[PDB]
From a paper:
The E. coli 50S large ribosomal subunit is composed of 33 proteins (L-proteins), one 23S and one 5S rRNA. The 23S rRNA consists of six architectural domains that, stabilized by the L-proteins, define the shape of the 50S subunit with its three protuberances. Here, we present a biochemical and cryo-EM based analysis of the earliest period of 50S assembly, utilizing an in vitro reconstitution system with purified rRNA and L-protein components. Taken together, early 50S assembly occurs in a domain-wise fashion, while late 50S assembly proceeds incrementally.
In addition, we noticed that the 5S RNP (ribonucleoprotein particle), consisting of 5S rRNA, uL5, uL18, and bL25, can dock on a pre-50S particle as soon as the central region of domain II has formed. This can occur both in early (d12-CP, d126-CP) and late assembly (C-CP) and goes along with formation of domain II helices H38 (A-site finger) and H42 (GAC), as well as domain V helices H80-H88, representing additional examples for rRNA induced rRNA stabilization or folding. However, the CP remains mobile and upon rotational movement of the 5S rRNA towards the subunit interface, H84 and H38 stabilize each other. The presence of domain II apparently facilitates docking of the CP-forming 5S RNP and as a consequence, route 1-2-6 involves the possibility of CP formation either on d12, or d126 resulting in d12-CP, or d126-CP, respectively.
Numbering used by the authors:
A (entry chain F): 1 to 177
B (entry chain W): 14 to 81
C (entry chain O): 2 to 117
The structure:
Amino acid sequence: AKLHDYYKDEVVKKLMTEFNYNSVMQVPRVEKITLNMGVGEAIADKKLLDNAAADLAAISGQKPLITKARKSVAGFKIRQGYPIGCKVTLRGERMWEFFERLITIAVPRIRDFRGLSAKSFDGRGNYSMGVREQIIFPEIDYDKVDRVRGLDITITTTAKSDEEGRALLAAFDFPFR
Amino acid sequence: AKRLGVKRFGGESVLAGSIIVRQRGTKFHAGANVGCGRDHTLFAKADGKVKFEVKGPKNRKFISIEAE
Amino acid sequence: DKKSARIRRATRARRKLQELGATRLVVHRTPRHIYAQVIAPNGSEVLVAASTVEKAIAEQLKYTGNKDAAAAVGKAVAERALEKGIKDVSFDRSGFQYHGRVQALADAAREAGLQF
RNA sequence: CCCGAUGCAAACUGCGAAUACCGGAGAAUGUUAUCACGGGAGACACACGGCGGGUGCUAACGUCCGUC
RNA sequence: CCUCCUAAAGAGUAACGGAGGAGCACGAAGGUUGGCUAAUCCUGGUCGGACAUCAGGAGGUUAGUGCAAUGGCAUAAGCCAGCUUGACUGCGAGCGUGACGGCGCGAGCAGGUGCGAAAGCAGGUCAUAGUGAUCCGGUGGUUCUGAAUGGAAGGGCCAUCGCUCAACG
RNA sequence: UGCCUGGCGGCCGUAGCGCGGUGGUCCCACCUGACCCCAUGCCGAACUCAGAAGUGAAACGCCGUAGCGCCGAUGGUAGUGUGGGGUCUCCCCAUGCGAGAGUAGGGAACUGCCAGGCA
C-alpha cells in the first residue's frame, strides 16, 4: 500500500468535499490499467513482437499476454486469429506502483507535452490514450532501443458518466490540458 | 426418398424402444423416459402414453411418455 | 453477471441429474454461511437441510463460514439425513468448484454415512 | 453502405383452419364390409370431366402431376 | 448421392425445372471433466483514409458450427484447457424403412477399459452426400478339410491392399 | 400466525424494458490481504482462504409509475368441406368450421416447502 493508504487519506476527503457524497466509497476508484500496444506493423516478422513483449514484461512486474485478431479483413490484409500485439492487466500493488511512477516522473518528461486530452474519453467516464516514444521511461535503456513504438494506457474507472471521470482525473491535479 | 416428420403422436400407445419422431434438427427434446439417438430420432425407453408439452423460458417443445 | 454465470453453469448439471428422476443434494457456498439441501425428484419439496445461519451450529464456531463451520454443517446434514433415511441421494455442487470447502463438506458427509 | 414508409415472393414466415392421416372413448346401422396364410387369376399404351397445381406466350380444343 | 420449392399441412408424388454441391477428411476436427460466450455500430487514439490491437457503450447470436444447402445448437452442438483412445470384445429387446435382399436407430446384458471425487458419460465425427454388390490377384495366420494310408497339392476360415464401370441396386 | 431476506420448482414476456422512491433488524452484496487451500493462456479477471475495518455506492429485494412489450375477447373480414347455379378465365347461393391484423379489457404477476430477523 505505497499509495493506496495515501490516496484514501488525501484524495477521498477532497473529492467528498467537492461532491458531498453520503458514502465514503461512492468516490470513483481505479480498478485496473490496460497496457496495450498498437504497433500495427508487427506483421513483417515475429522478432518485433517478441521484442515488444519483452519490453512490456520489463516495464511491468509480470509477463504480458498476447492477443489474436478479432476478425479477418482484406483492406488491412489481416487473417483470422493472427497475433498482432500483447497487453498487460495490473490489479493490486503493481498497478498502484505503475501509476505512481508514471504520474510522478513520466508525465513531466514529455517533449512538446500539450497535456492529456480531456475529451478523449470512452464516452462513459473512462480514459484511454497512447503516449508514443516509450523511451521516456528509464527502464527502456537508450542503448537497448530497436524501433520507435507507442503505448496504449487505459485507466479503468467506476465513473457513472464523464463528469465523475473528470473529477477523478483532476483529483490527481491534472497537470494541464 | 427419406421418411421424415412425426410417426407417433399424443395419446398414441408406443412399446418400449420405439421411434417417436424423426428430425434433421432437434425440434423436440427428451422428456421423461425418452432417449435421443445420433440422428435426433426420438425414442421411448419404456412403455407408456406419448404426450407433447411446451416448457422452458424459450417456449420449447418436449415429448414425454407417461408411465402406464 | 456473476450470479447469472453461476446459475447457468449449475442448471446444466441440475437437469442432467434430474433426468434420472432421483433425489439430489445441493450445497450453496456463501462467504458468510453455507447452505445445504436435499431435493426430492418432484423438485418442489424439502427433506433435509442444515445451515450455519441457525444459532444451533454457531455455538462452537467463531465465524459463520469456515473449515470448522463447513465440517459442522456436514455432520449436521449427515445426521439429519441418516435419522430421516434419505437412502443415498445424489449430490450436486451447485455448479461450483469441488476444490474448496465443498470437498471438505463432501468428505465429511461421506464419512458420516453418505453413499453418494 | 444504411434507415422510415409503400407492394410482392413456389425456393421468407414473428401468426394461421377449414379439409385428408394417425391415437383414445362413445349410442346407432352395415350378410365381418377388417386382417394373416395357402390354390388359382386377369391387366401391366387408358379417355373424358371437376377440383389445386407445374410446364406452356396464364393463346391453346397443348402437355404433365395428386384426388374424385 | 445430397440440399429448398415445385410436391397441393401425414409420407410419397410427374416434367429435357428452377439453384446447385460431393467421391471428401480427421488417430483430432472424437470421448470425458473443467472455464468461457458472438455478428454489427459509435466514441478516442502512432501511422487509422470509412474499415488493424486496445478502452467503453449499444447489440445478445443477424458470426461460428469444415464442406453447397436445409433444420437445429445458449444446458451451446462453438471456443480454450488436464487425460485418453468406448473408434473395445460377444451381444442386443423393440422400433422405423421400404416389393425385396437389405438398411438405420436402439434401451438394456456379460468381460475389461478411458474420463470424472462421485453422481454420471464414452460402442466415432450437430444430422442429412464421401461411395464400388459380383469374381480374379499380392501378403501373413488358422491340421478346418485332404479321392485306401504318412505327407504334399488343392479346397475352407480370419485381417489388409489393386477402381471417373462421372454410365456408378 | 403477519412483515422483511435466502435457497429449491411450476408458470415462460398478464413474469419484459424504462422512470421515481427505498434497503442494512437478520441475511445478502461490494471489499482488505493472499507470502498460506488454490488459480491466472498476464492480471486475486473468475474460484478459494482469514471479516465486519467501511458502505448499501453497484447487483439484487419491495411499492408506485401503463411511457414501452404481451395476450386478448365480441363483431366483422378473407379462407375453406359438402350440393347446386351462373355470364363457369371467376363468382354466388344453403349449410358447417371459421382467418391474419386491429378494437374493449388486463396486468408493474401468481403459486408450494423450509430456514434467519422483525412480531
